[PDB]
Design a protein around this ligand. Structure first.
Ligand code: DPV
Ligand code: DPV
Ligand code: DPV
Ligand code: DPV
Ligand code: DPV
Ligand code: DPV
Ligand code: DPV
Ligand code: DPV
Ligand code: DPV
Ligand code: DPV
Ligand code: DPV
Ligand code: DPV
Ligand code: DPV
Length: 24
């Protein structure tokens, strides 16, 4: 899976509210 940046970025997380790893 190698992470680094594949562990979300592009997978959506707008920031309104929170609870999605980017915010969470
Ligand atoms: C800038 C682009 C960078 C690309 C880097 C190369 C990615 C090649 C595709 C890898 C797909 C499979 O991945 P994975 O089985 O979860 O990991 C590899 C795990 N082992 C080493 C133990 C087999
Ligand atoms: C590039 C480095 C990261 C690789 C991480 C791999 C983790 C193991 C994935 C195992 C599941 C294999 O199904 P996939 O092909 O993913 O399912 C997508 C198939 N369609 C396109 C037809 C919908
Ligand atoms: C019309 C063109 C069709 C041919 C090109 C598309 C081939 C199908 C996709 C190739 C595999 C891409 O796996 P990935 O996103 O690195 O794995 C993500 C793994 N998880 C879902 C578990 C996070
Ligand atoms: C002729 C065909 C050539 C194909 C070349 C494919 C290269 C894929 C490389 C994927 C590397 C995945 O990251 P890693 O293993 O943790 O980094 C290793 C970094 N060093 C080598 C400096 C230790
Ligand atoms: C043209 C742009 C050149 C940028 C050069 C920046 C300095 C790089 C120093 C080398 C160490 C850092 O990078 P790396 O762990 O090998 O890469 C993956 C980095 N991320 C985890 C954030 C995705
Ligand atoms: C298929 C034809 C093209 C083959 C090209 C083969 C040579 C590729 C050399 C690539 C040199 C890149 O630097 P590095 O130290 O390994 O970065 C390591 C970066 N990670 C920590 C994110 C894994
Ligand atoms: C403008 C878009 C061009 C697309 C074509 C090129 C795609 C491949 C990018 C590969 C570079 C990604 O560098 P990184 O792993 O973050 O740093 C690695 C830094 N060192 C080499 C010093 C270890
Ligand atoms: C070019 C055509 C695109 C069409 C897309 C249609 C929806 C397919 C949904 C596929 C869901 C599984 O993949 P995923 O874990 O989200 O993908 C890899 C993303 N990350 C590296 C950030 C984990
Ligand atoms: C597509 C139209 C052109 C847009 C140009 C925007 C430039 C934004 C520059 C601000 C930094 C963006 O940092 P990031 O992407 O999160 O990290 C990339 C990290 N390295 C540079 C080391 C690879
Ligand atoms: C894997 C595909 C993900 C597509 C996500 C599109 C969201 C709408 C962006 C519209 C503005 C142009 O785009 P960008 O801000 O330069 O790129 C997206 C950068 N993030 C992934 C960090 C948000
Ligand atoms: C084989 C030729 C190369 C094809 C490459 C296609 C790339 C499609 C990118 C779709 C948008 C993905 O979101 P992004 O913000 O740009 O993701 C990088 C995440 N950081 C900004 C944090 C570094
Ligand atoms: C050498 C030529 C390189 C060409 C590189 C092309 C990169 C194209 C990246 C396209 C990323 C598309 O993801 P997205 O916006 O979320 O669409 C999927 C939207 N639905 C789930 C609603 C269907
Ligand atoms: C002709 C040789 C190939 C050229 C390169 C084409 C690169 C196309 C990249 C397409 C990337 C598609 O986004 P993804 O994250 O996997 O979508 C999964 C669903 N979300 C966007 C919602 C997370």
């Amino acid at each position: 899976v190698t992470x680094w940046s594949l562990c979300x970025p592009g997978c959506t997380x707008p920031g309104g509210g929170x609870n999605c790893x980017f915010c969470x």
